[PDB]
Symmetry: C3
Subunit: 307 residues, 3 copies
């Protein structure tokens, strides 16, 4: 029953099977998903290595029939090289700000509703991505090229068979972030910045962990388009008791000077094993009459198996 | 060349590569397919475990060119928990009646043409599924929630950005089945029921196995819509001689009081190994002038490798 | 962390993660891709075996947003049987001429621009494929059935529910090739032929390898439609120095009596390990004013991890 890699010294296969039931106004939606991933690494010498990575996400939307479900999202497709000076990759990979949004994104299902990341800062293709650790300072960066297109003699996009010349879409950008870990103390701070076409943002964050408790704060500010502001605040707390972890978050965002998210959420997660867990979560959506839909609370129940 | 699971104690990778040539009126169609699956299990204690499962189906339809083939069907996406009282899952998984249709679904390619299962009884998402064994009695059940949707102030389906309130599609339902195995004797009986919106059905079945022979009967009856009956009958026989297994079935169904299927089929399957087999099969389609297409016989030839 | 095959004695998992940056007129396109493959083999006796194979290709096209990327191509889906007299498969697999085009297709990214293969000769479904080695002679062949369709009483394609009779698309064809290896000398010659509907072609090739050097020639000639000629020429050279391999090719094709490709290209590839390599490549496109687009040079940079 023995499984081998064709060419590598080794291959790590991972991902999840994650059953998720969402209840809003007593009505049920299946938000379940599978992820499959493949990680290969080639040691070159004891200070240099090559890496390759894929991850896909697979869902269903039957709507009451045994349908054919052709739903795939290639979340990551990259190769890279790393070693003494860090790691650099090309192809769809994470920008710089995810490690900052992680300060307050601690829940099983809810949270992360007021820390919007633009593409170059989040996860996107046609991008070089860098990371490295220098003592207690963790750094990330990315640079994204604008995407080549083909245009007619008037400059409109057409098929390469019938085009006059190449142009591009102006979607270049970059991101940067740093995190300082204060020795063994449990304290971290973080910051980052990103810029792409008419969008820019910065983030600042801090956190503390001590034994069975955790808390953290996050501030996000910038512009999602020309003269369209965005500002967001999140706070987070966590408590561990045996194999159970309980979390709460408060998230608040405004967009174009109007409240766009306002949510307090709490959950309980039970770890039967490190890779098998159940959870239940409730999000109080505190926007007023926002339409009724935009304001509905959410109950979520789940079971998560990690491969 | 060594392959590891990222987080699990173990991972089982399975599926098939199955070459299938279909001939009708001397004209060939490629019905070949690949299935890939991933099964993870986490032992919690010696009476409790967690489970996660994915399976996809992958085909081609070139029609004479070297085409790009984007054909995927996520057949199963689920997690569950089981142990002393049985197993329960959420996400796309089997309803109760497949283990009943299996009494007569014994051929490599043909058969199973007069035992139609509705969605909640077959395989569908937004569904809790249960199974367990109590002595010689095997039981299954499922319950399906209706699917949440979003509607305008007049109650028509629209995008959640522009909706007034949540509603649903009324596609709730349930299924149940039981199978009794009569000790070591080779005798089994089975029954089940399913109900969803305007559809309901029941099934009754029996089978006998003794050494190199097998035979079985199946009866299906109910409604596929309001005042639209469905009744189906199947009989099956099987004979094993060395590494070859030969099967024959007769299947007959009526729908809205008219004959909709009438097929006698026979095949031979040779097991070179437990996981590599060839087959040939012929289906006599006995409907009269039904159009010519609806009445054509089918010859099928195949080769099946299981991973 | 242990990974097993469900039913096989063993399973080989392979493929690649391949980062590729393409630059034309200073404008960047992400041509990166992942391939995943699964190869199973069942030994029957010491002169007979069964085989099953899948391979998929997975890409992204974000165009500056963190998009959902549903891009899959099932490149191979087949099962087969082989042993003393060779191997035969059915389902999407290679026709006969790829092993001939390989004489001059030696670069990491460029080359293979003037050796066009028709479907039955390239890779296509509804096809039997054969290969075998008889002393120093390597042979391949394939035969493709025309694809069944369903037509109305006037002979137009419609759904099988509403059709009168079955017809087909006339897309039958075959291919054949042979390669003679002259003992230990480093010399090979090759030839092949293919025919499908209104297309036919032949190929002739020769190559020499000696130590750190390689060179080769390829000639292709035939018709891509009724009274639409195609002729192509390629030359190739290769030099290895430590872990670096350098290649150059010249490719020239005419179609309907006009020059359709004219490219000289050169590259360098560094093998850090057998399964991890970087490359850089430049293609001089020598067509004149062809539109500007059709004539642009290409710089390509890459990193390739093989699983
Ligand atoms: C015990 C710590 C409480 C946390 C205080 C911070 C919460 C900030 O809430 C602002 C709510 O304003 C909008 C009301 O809707
Ligand atoms: C030797 C056992 C024969 C099996 C008898 C059951 C077959 C029932 O056939 C009914 C056919 O009626 C429709 C004819 O078309
Ligand atoms: C040192 C070996 C040189 C290789 C000679 C063969 C190249 C043939 O080139 C023909 C170019 O004609 C088209 C010009 O555009």
């Amino acid at each position: 029953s023995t499984v081998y890699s064709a060419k590598g010294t080794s291959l790590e296969v991972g991902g999840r099977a994650e059953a998720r039931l969402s209840l809003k106004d007593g009505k049920a939606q299946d938000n379940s998903r599978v992820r499959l991933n493949f990680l290969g690494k080639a040691e070159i010498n004891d200070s240099l290595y090559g890496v390759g990575f894929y991850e896909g996400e697979f869902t269903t939307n039957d709507q009451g029939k045994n349908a054919s479900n052709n739903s795939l999202d290639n979340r990551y497709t990259y190769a890279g090289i790393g070693g003494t000076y860090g790691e650099v990759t090309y192809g769809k990979n994470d920008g710089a700000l995810g490690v900052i949004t992680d300060f307050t994104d601690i829940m099983s299902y809810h949270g992360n509703t007021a820390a919007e990341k633009i593409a170059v800062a989040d996860r996107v293709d046609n991008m070089l991505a860098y990371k490295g650790q220098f003592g207690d300072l963790g750094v990330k960066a990315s640079y994204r090229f604008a995407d080549r297109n083909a245009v007619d003699a008037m400059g409109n996009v057409v098929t390469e068979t019938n085009a006059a010349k190449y142009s591009d879409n102006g979607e270049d950008g970059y991101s940067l972030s740093a995190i300082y870990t204060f020795g063994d103390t449990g304290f971290n701070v973080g910051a980052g910045y990103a810029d792409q076409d008419d969008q820019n943002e910065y983030m600042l964050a801090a956190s503390y962990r001590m034994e069975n408790l955790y808390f953290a704060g996050l501030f996000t500010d910038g512009e999602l388009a020309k003269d369209v502001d965005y500002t967001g605040y999140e706070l987070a707390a966590g408590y561990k008791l045996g194999q159970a972890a309980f979390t709460a978050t408060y998230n608040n965002a405004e967009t174009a000077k109007k409240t766009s998210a306002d949510n307090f959420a709490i959950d309980a997660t039970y770890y039967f094993k490190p890779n098998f867990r159940s959870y239940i979560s409730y999000q109080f959506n505190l926007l007023d009459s926002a339409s009724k839909v935009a304001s509905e609370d959410e109950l979520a129940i789940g079971l998560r198996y990690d491969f």
